[PDB]
């Protein structure tokens, strides 16, 4: 068609249509024969497959990049001048136009620069592909958590695979990146070692969420969903809280128990999750897996513009 002379350089209405990656954070993606620099050591892979989690030895982002990403997260929750492309989001805590002490966002890779770029970050996608047995890895979705200062709540015990029951096979991983320095007094991730292999790769019953209650009970509700043997393994290996720097990344199994603490510092705390999924993955029902997305039928392979292939071992 004919694009007006002052609209030639614009981007699509949503960044999903943009094939490839923009050069915003780390420039252009490396060449085909340049992807071996970002490989990770086998011991990290063994640690993940043993504990159900591991920390990447090197921070994945420079401090300027973390500053830019924190600015994007701040602008995603303006609440006075709402973010453009807000209608391109799977779910938002500002749908009520009031917000609260916890701001959670999903599918923001179609909304802002940099967040879309972070998906194709080589250092994390190569590691996730190595965890997923060297196959094509497709983004499942992102997530952003922002907790206010002195009142931020905590999300209790949960399993990631409990939210993805519409997807047939167990082939996933999660990468969590800290956009601000975190510790047990501000949203630290607390995980149980060796919990991804408890119920023969099964899902534990959901926990009871009662808001407006102290963090101690919220984190102690764990003794309600487990059995005696899981209790003994808990006693041997109590849940461990992990400290993260301003750029450090953490790989988590989909099936390991996971929680985050409250925020009792004097500033808001930010973190970002991205879930990565393997090639051989099918659907179970007929329809869209996420709101306003391409619909699948029976056991159809999951592809499309909504689940782009981020890395290819060929």
């Amino acid at each position: 068609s004919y694009v007006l002379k002052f609209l030639r350089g614009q981007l699509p209405e949503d960044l999903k249509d943009v094939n490839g990656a923009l050069g915003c954070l780390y420039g252009t993606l490396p060449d085909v024969d340049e992807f071996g620099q970002f490989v990770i050591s086998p011991d990290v892979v063994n640690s993940f497959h043993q504990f159900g989690y591991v920390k990447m030895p090197i921070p994945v982002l420079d401090h300027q990049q973390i500053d830019k990403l924190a600015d994007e997260v701040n602008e995603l929750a303006n609440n006075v001048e709402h973010h453009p492309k807000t209608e391109r989001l799977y779910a938002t805590s500002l749908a009520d136009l009031t917000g609260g002490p916890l701001f959670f966002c999903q599918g923001q890779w179609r909304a802002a620069w940099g967040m879309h770029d972070l998906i194709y970050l080589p250092t994390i996608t190569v590691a996730a592909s190595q965890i997923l047995n060297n196959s094509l890895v497709r983004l499942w979705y992102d997530e952003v958590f922002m907790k206010a200062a002195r009142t931020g709540p905590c999300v209790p015990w949960q399993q990631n695979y409990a939210r993805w029951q519409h997807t047939k096979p167990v082939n996933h991983v999660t990468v969590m990146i800290a956009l601000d320095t975190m510790n047990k007094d501000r949203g630290a991730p607390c995980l149980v070692p060796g919990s991804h292999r408890w119920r023969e790769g099964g899902l534990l019953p959901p926990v009871s969420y009662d808001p407006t209650k102290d963090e101690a009970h919220q984190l102690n509700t764990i003794w309600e969903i487990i059995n005696e043997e899981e209790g003994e393994m808990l006693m041997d290996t109590p849940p461990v809280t992990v400290d993260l720097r301003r750029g450090e990344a953490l790989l988590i199994h989909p099936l390991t128990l996971f929680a985050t603490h409250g925020n009792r510092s004097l500033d808001a705390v930010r973190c970002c999750f991205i879930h990565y999924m393997g090639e051989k993955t099918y659907a179970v029902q007929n329809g869209p897996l996420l709101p306003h997305t391409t619909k699948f039928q029976a056991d159809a392979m999951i592809q499309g513009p909504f689940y782009p292939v981020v890395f290819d071992p060929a």
């Binding site: 501000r186 510092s265 004097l266 500033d267």
Partner: peptide
């Protein structure tokens, strides 16, 4: 180191 950590965590007014 502990004072550095306390200032790093925004734990001091």
């Amino acid at each position: 180191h502990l004072i550095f950590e306390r200032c790093k965590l925004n734990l001091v007014e």
